[PDB]
Amino acid sequence: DEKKDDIKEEKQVDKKLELRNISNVELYTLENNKYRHVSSLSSVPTNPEAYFMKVKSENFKDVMLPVKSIESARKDNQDVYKIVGQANDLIQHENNITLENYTYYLPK
């Protein structure tokens, strides 16, 4: 239970990538050698890496993210699969904390 005192002046703020106005996001897969829109019902954590995250917005064009990991969780005490995109420096500023990759949750 120890803390370190830090003095910091923002001469150079953190220069990282972020998605500022992301709207609903799709999801795709290579389940049957063809790219199909698996919009929901990720019943089992599909262990290969044949999924990509095609986020969509309204203030600028869509962005495509190959997935990193699929993990079951309970965002609201529900069967929810946690999925994360991969990029060199992409971060998500949610709830006053910094996440090293973009993440969203499938409720259904």
Added chain:
Amino acid sequence: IEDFNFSSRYETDYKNLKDADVSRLRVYKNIEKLLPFYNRETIVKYGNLVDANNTLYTKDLVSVVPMKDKEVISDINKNKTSINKLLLHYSDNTSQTLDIKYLQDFSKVAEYEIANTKLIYTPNTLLHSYNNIVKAVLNDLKSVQYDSDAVRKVLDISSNIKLTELYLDEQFTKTKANIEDSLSKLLSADAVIAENSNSIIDNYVIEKIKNNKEAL
């Protein structure tokens, strides 16, 4: 009703930041189009760095990047060369240009600095190579005939009805000849690809273009 998105992930707020200024709200909104793909801290810092004298205060729309009035689009093919000019089409239907230099790009995003007002411009592309996709699908696009049967099937046309009512055959041959550059620019300007190691997204783009080659 929605399903766990567009509300918790919306997070477009520019108010109540560390150095947020209510007066410079529209300044931040204008500078957003100049510097996409960056954190809110950087964007508010640069908005605070905006001089009050310059015309960035008025409403701004999407900028474009011309090189001596050539209006380049393929950033990856021209990031090394200087895109000297950068038009700023404001919502007031007024056009301004600015001197631009290339300096200190990331591995993904390219940074351009404006000498006069010490601001930064970035384009809407991650400098991702489309060489793999274009080489995969080139020779497939090259084997399409304007008067063939597949092209007729793509249209809602019968075999009897002629194609002479379109007047596009010579331009069809022209676009067959120069499909390389046009396809590269389209792939650069359609969406954003952040892939680094795998090829699943590139293969998805290849499948999408291959499925509708004649329509394209």
